[PDB]
Amino acid sequence: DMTFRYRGPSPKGDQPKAIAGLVEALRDGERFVTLLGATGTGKTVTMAKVIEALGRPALVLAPNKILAAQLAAEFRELFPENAVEYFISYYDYYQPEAYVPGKDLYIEKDASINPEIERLRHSTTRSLLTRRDVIVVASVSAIYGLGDPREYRARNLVVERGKPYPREVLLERLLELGYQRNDIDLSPGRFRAKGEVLEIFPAYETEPIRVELFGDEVERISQVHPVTGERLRELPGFVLFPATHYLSPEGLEEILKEIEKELWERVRYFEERGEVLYAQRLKERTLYDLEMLRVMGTCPGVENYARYFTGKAPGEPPYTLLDYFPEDFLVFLDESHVTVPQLQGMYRGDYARKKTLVDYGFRLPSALDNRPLRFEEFLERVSQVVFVSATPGPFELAHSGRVVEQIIR
């Protein structure tokens, strides 16, 4: 009753019984529970009552970004005072890198990307570390790979007013958090320093922060409007979280060395096979990528090298959004009959795409380690799953210990 504050309509009819039935199932420790028949507003009202009753952070997956947006909006109304995050990915809107051999066609990752996507993703991980009253609503792309959250947690930056913090150190720690310097265009995940004035745009923020320095002392802190410069608030201080989710305790040069080692092995493989074109394709793309990394700390498609930034071993499952929750979160799978098959086939479908890229020299084999979880890998990262559907599919009915009805036609 303390974590979340439900401000919405009261359930009528038998809906209180469906809420109680789910709460009973989950408090029993049932691993698989099905809500059957719920539709429209009553669906999210029941979920919300269950989430409030149990007081745990919640992950809610939808078949696609559009339905996730609808769910998030409903949840924002039912919990106006809690963090309702919306988690989506590039792959919800744009075509991935791919190569179809039958037509000798390379499809590049879309370079012109909406910055809102990374902003929402960063708002999500920021909330999941800073508070318990989080409900993340996401497409199935939550279970695609992400970086080490142990480093995301540990690599923060605390600024208080009326204290230094000398200047040249603040710019060092900003670059350590992945913030690029751009004085022309200040967009999220970037900073600007002219004189004793420092403008920091946190990767999760809609409004950058203005830090004014008098010598070492932090003279003034103000949150500023992005387009007009208008001061909107004064800040006593703030905690800055990183600007990428791929953060390693190993050094960048060391990482780039590990990657080049794999590059030359793989070129040796192609060259020994007479596949000159694949080797030179692979060198051009990989070296270009590492050079963008070395100079800017990040590159487009850095997630291809995710194994090297997380210390995972080949074949090991990667970190996902699942690792950014506290230990006791709760999963709902909306449109269970669609969402479960999606979860089941993420790996094989992703693997199919990247294996072609790896076979023909577009990517190193290590890129296969930046992958969605296998369905049993998913089921091992979660404690309890609530399947939500009016037409629950075979997996839900085969494995649920409880199936609670909510038929309001």
Partner: protein, 47 residues
Amino acid sequence: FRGGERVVHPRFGPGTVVAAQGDEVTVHFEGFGLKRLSLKYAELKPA
């Protein structure tokens, strides 16, 4: 749990642990049959 252990569940009563894979424990209960449970939340006590 290794399997065979006697446990007691706050609502299902006496049961016997069948399997255990990580946080998932499978317990067979007199009244309710086989249950696939989460260890964090089952509140199992040893019998």
